[PDB]
Symmetry: D2
Subunit: 354 residues, 4 copies
């Protein structure tokens, strides 16, 4: 039979459609959602034709669910189990896994199937490929609002911290304090950073950035970002800069503010432009040892399990990211439009299913 889902129809057009219910392969699971959350990624897919032009493709890639059914080879999950579903759900049997980059298993960024090559999570059911490798059990002591921050927001933000090569006591700059940037701040704290400098203006974000460990807040007003951060560091710069937002020009701010031998760690999706500019002089004319990394978030069962431990054992509380809680399935359209309209008091919305 069929089922209901909130999809993208054409560029700039969304709505509800009705498709045949998904069925699992023997290694797969069919999940029904318990809490979902929309993303800026869904917006660039609709109002910018980012991943190309789809047609009746259900949106959303951050979900916590209850396993509805599992194929015959699924060993560690059974119907009724409550699970965190990672946003990345890669095919784990490729040479790219053997090379150590599961995010690109099968091609560049091919590990991200939800709302891309597959129907997303904004439905009554969705399909998880390789349940034993892409699902993790949700402890009862973690509320659905916090868990639904793990699949994408926590892992991307913590990945920026990881890529930053943060040594103990190093000063970190986080450029952008949306939900991803906020998690990059907590991840920097989770890496032994001393001083953490957050760049942003939204006061709900600025309050949350301090709560996640920021010691300084640089505003887009009050001066230019480069000069402000160099003044705070007394002309020394930062050891690492985690890019978590902006357009291509932020790449030059980060290269200008990190010291020689430091790291620029980007987790931002650059949606437009042919090139991202690296400033030649502040990159030491090519010889300043300022490493630039840019990475898609890790995913999979073990990645979620480790983030679940950080939430369980009280190392990070991702709930303060949730500024809007809706109840009920039909509120997915509301939360989606909230991510497009983006009021000043919004960080991340969550739809809890009845």
């Amino acid at each position: 039979h069929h089922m209901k889902g909130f999809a993208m129809l054409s560029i700039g057009k969304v709505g509800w459609i009705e498709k045949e219910k998904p069925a699992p392969g023997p290694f797969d699971a069919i999940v029904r959602p318990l809490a979902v959350a929309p993303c800026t990624s869904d917006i660039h897919t609709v109002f910018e034709g980012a991943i190309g032009e789809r047609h009746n493709m259900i949106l959303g890639h951050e979900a916590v669910g209850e396993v509805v059914e599992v194929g015959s080879e699924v060993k560690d999950f059974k119907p009724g189990d409550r699970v965190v579903v990672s946003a990345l759900t890669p095919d784990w049997r490729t040479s790219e896994v053997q090379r150590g980059y599961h995010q690109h298993s099968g091609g560049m960024l091919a590990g991200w199937k939800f709302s891309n090559v597959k129907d997303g999570v904004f439905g009554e059911f969705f399909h998880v490929n390789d349940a034993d490798m892409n699902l993790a059990h949700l402890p009862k002591e973690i509320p659905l609002e916090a868990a639904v921050m793990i699949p994408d927001m926590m892992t991307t933000g913590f990945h920026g911290a990881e890529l930053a090569d943060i040594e103990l006591g190093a000063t970190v700059a986080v450029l952008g304090i949306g939900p991803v940037g906020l998690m990059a701040v907590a991840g920097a704290k989770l890496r032994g950073a001393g001083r953490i400098i957050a760049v942003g203006s939204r006061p709900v974000c600025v309050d949350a950035a301090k709560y996640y460990g920021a010691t300084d807040i640089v505003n887009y007003k009050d001066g230019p970002i480069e000069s402000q951060i160099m003044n705070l560091t007394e002309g020394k710069g930062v050891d690492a800069a985690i890019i978590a937002g902006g357009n291509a020009d932020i790449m030059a701010t980060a290269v200008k503010i990190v010291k020689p031998g430091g790291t620029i760690a980007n987790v931002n999706y650059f949606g437009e432009g042919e090139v991202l500019p690296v400033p030649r002089l502040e990159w030491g004319c090519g010889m300043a040892h300022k490493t630039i990394k840019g990475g898609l978030c890790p995913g999979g069962r073990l990645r979620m399990e480790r983030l679940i431990d950080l939430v369980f054992y009280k190392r990070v509380d991702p709930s303060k990211l949730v500024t809007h809680v809706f109840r009920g399935f039909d509120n997915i359209e509301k939360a989606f439009m909230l991510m497009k309209d983006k009021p000043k008091d919004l960080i991340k919305p969550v739809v809890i299913l009845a």
Copy 2:
């Protein structure tokens, strides 16, 4: 005027106060007078176990915050009157080992360790710091003295255990031994993003500080073998890393038994007895379990101290909880030293505050 009073080891087994010539600096050195000092168990091994051999009239101690008295003509960043954290390690910084990336072993194995070894320690009215510009860090006024004197050694050693452990975001970590060094390995594990931290120790004062610094489980090596309790705690999985910060040589076999394949054993504890540290063949995968074993003298130098000052300054770790005894008075050095020798059940770390 030309002399100086200090607490010294007279010979193996005997300590006492002596008088000695004041040290003068070289062009790059500084003379520093103690503002606060702390004794270490390393000094107990040296006096009473001869761990480093015979010394006559050597002033002990190697953890000090102090005020600069005199600087050589080439010292650029430190003038008399400056309050400085003194790196416990004071390497010669122009050696091939520094270029190899191991300042701790500049000029020889453990040769960056000079205080109360090849040079008079900090338990005197004055002491010599070689290469002030590289081995001193400026002390913020916002940091109390008793908390700052934890940085030269206790903080940088415990943190080295966590750095060597290769901790990943959310990994499970076991800290073996929770004296002052193990307690700072617990905090360092938390700094590197450990999820579950399993602390191993018996004394209540250390167990309380272990939970303060981030331990989520306590294993008492009296309720049964450590390895059985930890294996049951992790339901057969083991731990991603085991930081060794105390115990006899047998603790190395315990660490190997509790870390999973691919995990790390990071030792920072000093072993003073026994010919061999046992690595069990079976639980080391007969040589192929990928259980890396590290063991390293603590990092020192100015950059090391500054980064740790920053961690205290920005409220990332409060080492003040390590200080169970604070004595005011230069001569309480001796009494604080004997605390380290006797080890009462409520002692973690003592601090002597000078005038």
Copy 3:
């Protein structure tokens, strides 16, 4: 249904009969074109270094021809000439997501052939996950050099990988049997400048020089530690790779590596309860002498990269083969060469083709 050479009991070997393997939907059945015996099967048979087994066909080093594939195999077809990895792991585990496929499902569990499944010393053998655990063999590589890729090349190279060799570093290789010889060439592939090889057999000493060793230390001629200290002018070595010896070679390796260097073991220790780490020369725990010890990487990607190193003439493993025999019967003879360890042996190869 089929025959093969097997460990019957601890210390006891011989031929047995088995039901012919059938492949699961992701597996392949392979018949051997060429196999080789290992010292590791010796340690397992005549020492029970991992415990007892019953009716287990032996062997883990084989180049072969696929005879049957499963329903979901995509890149491998019946008739394909393949390099089979000694380690044939289940690639869908938590340990693979942690970066340790060698221990997928448990310590050393990536190692299935002649450990927990019937090996390659048989008319046929089972390969789990063909797409992930097989590599296509180019025509340009002969069988005798190709059957050194599954195990000797990957283990010896892994020792060089664990050693953290810097450009121009001085590296010591302890043991120059087949694994140590590939560790000498691995260190050469990692930019080692000076390479000191330790060993006794003249056939090994000669191949050690061929692969890159600049110096030879005969452990029977005198203490390794004194000889190496003389060669390096008391400075020691930057890294020491262990590819042979008894348990005490661990102390030798710690004593010859300088502070901050690495000890990289790839040797299978089969005897004794403990491996001794000498307390004094390990800096009493603080010398930064890192000790590693790992089972060789396996799988399709690992084999494809080693194939490239042979194809582009970066290493020639064919000099490891000192004995070649033909036919199933001679597997027995080649296995005893590994046990009897005669003085002109490095590695034997049995051609079935």
Copy 4:
């Protein structure tokens, strides 16, 4: 008391007479036994690369004989024949402790010769921190090879070091000037399997093959991205080392490496506002294509490690030396060659011994 070849102004060069340099207690005075010119000096002069200078002696690649030492110099005495490192940094700084001596005291401040100091193109020159920035030169290495060590060898090898080359990985080297040629050898030294060298000067193409290049790619036969993509059957390269080209070579490098691979720059980019990163081929910021660009390591240890690589015949840099001149006056001739290299020249050496 000294004659040197110097930058008179922007655009003008010539022999001048300055006062003899005098050693600090830790520095040494050295006279050149053999020198080589660089293309950076061409930028420094004929392009105003580093502002203006007056009477600043040029050059920064020299093998020399120690003439004078300060009272604190322990390991070098007058008359010692030494390799002098191009990067002569202040080893007592914050950046040394952070692990970046190339930037000790500032961004690229480890560079002093023909920058903030009189270069090696003089009867004498000053080396700061002699014990830390000189290495003894064994008699076994000819002067022409040894002078290839201070810059060409250490820069080109650093590109391979930065590349994170795994054993058997496929590496591309963009540009086959002397730095690219050493980058090809460095990749061989890191265990690269297939090495795709990009360039077209016939002296450099023959030189690239000699150092391990398995493929050569000429811009004349098509675009670089398409040829390399076609050579790897669309798979790409595991690492690309940039050793030449305009700013847009950065875009060619991102396009040819697979996701998860590394672009490693060691090329001097002297023109343009930005170095371009092609957004789409960088995975819109998430393709895990790490970009590295680093100045060459310096110091006594780096030089000793590369001396061993030449001493033990791991690389022979002699092939970089296409032209050998004799006599001081010929310095200007050799320097002028770098302004516009003949299509048969890689690197020139002036012998003064």
